[model samples]
Target: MKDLMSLVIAPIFVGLVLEMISRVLDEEDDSRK
Candidate 1:
């Protein structure tokens, strides 16, 4: 069902987005150095 799928995927999707955001920021920091 939609509810079940959202519950499972939401956390993973948010985590992945956050991970990529952090990685991009880290890369920017390295470049600034």
Candidate 2:
């Protein structure tokens, strides 16, 4: 049960990073021609 948390947290942290990247990338597109 202890090591199980590592697996769960790994993807969640990565996904958050991905979401943040996407947010900024999309916003940049809207700001430019």
Candidate 3:
């Protein structure tokens, strides 16, 4: 149960974090271009 949680939670958290970062980066790119 713990291992399953770790596997699921880590990816979800990382994905959410990366998505926010990417959006910020894209907005900056659009502003510059």
Worst 10 residues of 2 by lDDT: 24-33
Instruction: Write candidate 2's Cα lDDT for 1-33 as tens digits.
Output: 759798899999999999988898767555545
lDDT per residue for candidate 3 within 3-30, as digits (tens), equals: 6989889899989999988898767544
lDDT of 2: 0.84
Local distance difference test scores for all models: 0.81, 0.84, 0.83
- For every model shown, the clashing-pair count is 0, 0, 0
Q: What's the best-to-worst order under lDDT?
A: 2, 3, 1
Best model per lDDT: 2
Ten residues in a row with the worst lDDT in model 1? 24-33
Note the residue pairs that clash in candidate 1.
Answer: none
* Candidate ordering by TM-score (highest first): 3, 2, 1
Higher-ranked by TM-score: 2 or 3: 3
**Error at 14, model 2, angstroms:** 0.6
Model 3: lDDT of residue 30: 48
